[PDB]
Design an enzyme around this catalytic site. Sequence first.
Site, PDB file in Angstrom:
ATOM      1  CG  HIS A   1      -0.309  -0.067   2.523  1.00 23.81           C
ATOM      2  ND1 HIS A   1       0.293   1.022   3.118  1.00 23.81           N
ATOM      3  CD2 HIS A   1      -0.116  -1.110   3.364  1.00 23.81           C
ATOM      4  CE1 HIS A   1       0.814   0.658   4.276  1.00 23.81           C
ATOM      5  NE2 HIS A   1       0.578  -0.631   4.450  1.00 23.81           N
TER       6      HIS A   1
ATOM      7  CB  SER B   1      -0.398   4.724   6.623  1.00 24.45           C
ATOM      8  OG  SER B   1       0.696   4.979   7.479  1.00 24.45           O
TER       9      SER B   1
ATOM     10  CD1 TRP C   1      -0.690   7.748  12.506  1.00 24.97           C
ATOM     11  CD2 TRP C   1       0.033   5.899  13.541  1.00 24.97           C
ATOM     12  NE1 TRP C   1      -1.374   7.641  13.690  1.00 24.97           N
ATOM     13  CE2 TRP C   1      -0.949   6.518  14.349  1.00 24.97           C
ATOM     14  CE3 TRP C   1       0.632   4.715  13.991  1.00 24.97           C
ATOM     15  CZ2 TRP C   1      -1.346   5.992  15.585  1.00 24.97           C
ATOM     16  CZ3 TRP C   1       0.240   4.191  15.220  1.00 24.97           C
ATOM     17  CH2 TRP C   1      -0.742   4.831  16.002  1.00 24.97           C
TER      18      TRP C   1
ATOM     19  NE  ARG D   1      -0.693  -0.128   7.378  1.00 25.07           N
ATOM     20  CZ  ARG D   1      -0.776  -0.706   8.569  1.00 25.07           C
ATOM     21  NH1 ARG D   1      -1.877  -0.591   9.306  1.00 25.07           N
ATOM     22  NH2 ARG D   1       0.259  -1.391   9.032  1.00 25.07           N
TER      23      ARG D   1
ATOM     24  CD  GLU E   1       4.569  -3.724   7.908  1.00 26.95           C
ATOM     25  OE1 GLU E   1       5.239  -4.738   7.636  1.00 26.95           O
ATOM     26  OE2 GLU E   1       4.651  -2.660   7.253  1.00 26.95           O
TER      27      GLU E   1
ATOM     28  CG  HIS F   1       0.844  -4.513   5.389  1.00 23.59           C
ATOM     29  ND1 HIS F   1       0.156  -3.336   5.595  1.00 23.59           N
ATOM     30  CD2 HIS F   1      -0.065  -5.507   5.508  1.00 23.59           C
ATOM     31  CE1 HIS F   1      -1.111  -3.609   5.844  1.00 23.59           C
ATOM     32  NE2 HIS F   1      -1.275  -4.919   5.785  1.00 23.59           N
TER      33      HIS F   1
END
Lengths: 229, 235
Positions: A9, A12, A14, A60, A87, A182
């Site tokens: 992806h 994000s 963060w 995500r 992840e 991830h």
Amino acid sequence: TYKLTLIRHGESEWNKENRFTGWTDVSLSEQGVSEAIEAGRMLLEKGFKFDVVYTSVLKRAIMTTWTVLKELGNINCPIINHWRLNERHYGALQGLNKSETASKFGEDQVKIWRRSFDVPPPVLEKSDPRWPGNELIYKGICPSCLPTTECLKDTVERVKPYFEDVIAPSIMSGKSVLVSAHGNSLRALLYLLEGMTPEQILEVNIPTACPLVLELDDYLKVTKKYYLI
Amino acid sequence: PRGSTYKLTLIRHGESEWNKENRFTGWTDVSLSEQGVSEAIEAGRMLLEKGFKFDVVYTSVLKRAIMTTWTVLKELGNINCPIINHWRLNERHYGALQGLNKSETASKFGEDQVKIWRRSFDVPPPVLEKSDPRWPGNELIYKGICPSCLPTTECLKDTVERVKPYFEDVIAPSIMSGKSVLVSAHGNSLRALLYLLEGMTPEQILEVNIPTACPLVLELDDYLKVTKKYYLIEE
């Protein structure tokens, strides 16, 4: 003989915040969505159509998948989510700034926990909200599966049987498979499919929202790999 | 509450592009309109207000229901919810009426037979020829499905008969497991489910209309028969 497509992806909410995420179920950023849209269009241009997508239980990656499928005009494609594609778990580092981890823990030993194959961050207590056994997403899962912390070794070891028993049969059946996940889950797959050493996978960087095509053996080992870029 | 033991939620999608064009759709894989997306958003928000969270969603293989599902789940903050698509939840097939207006149908067919095709329980629209591009055997989404499953036409009776074993063998076990289940599908698929779960007569269900993008909550027996039902909306 076989063809497997991987995608990680985009950024994000963060990634910009310079925060350790791991299993924290954080959103894609606006830019992360746009990256998914371009990945989808890149795949459309290159004539891809998938029969199944395997993804994680983290929103995500799921949103990335939904976005890519929309751009592919393939939203009818079956999607299977599973925690084994999550992840890598980051233990006590989760939710903390690069700066906040430097304060509470050793600034140097945090960098050990990110750059190592076999050394995990500190454990979460079960009372701590962060612990996965608090989220309704993991409600009916074998408790022993739900980590308090994870190193890269721990991640490859829980990804492995998922490839063996789930993704591999799909591949072998002749399906067009995408894995939407991830950084660490995808590196776990590479480590396994290419037959890497622990030091070899530490040298591997997977770019965000950039489709990686693996051509595979009869034995499901990588013969060649390339990005759609 | 006392007398029921399970809860099942149903939703049909909001307006598609062919609703706007007032065309018979059936299995035609048409998009939601922007209004239909908005209606899905409203439904999601309503569900969130009412404290709903799903463990699984069953939907069809038709993009308007699948997009409704994804939209609702996003609004619910429930994106992580497993979604299972299956053709058995598809809209009733409309045969040779698929794609046609009320000017197009009146030209091709007659007003007597058209009324029955739309309203009856056991009388289907005319059959698609396999050579017709509209025939479901032409679509890649059905590639590995047993050919006998793919209809050339359907009356409501037909829809009920193919929905039934999907409830029996797939949806029922999820419910009995204690899962919180949403079924996100279509007008005739959902009416088929109501026909089965309420034990209706074919006459009883012909008078039943399900409003679009309006969650319908069914409370169920130990026997998975409806004790009571209510919409989330008095609107």
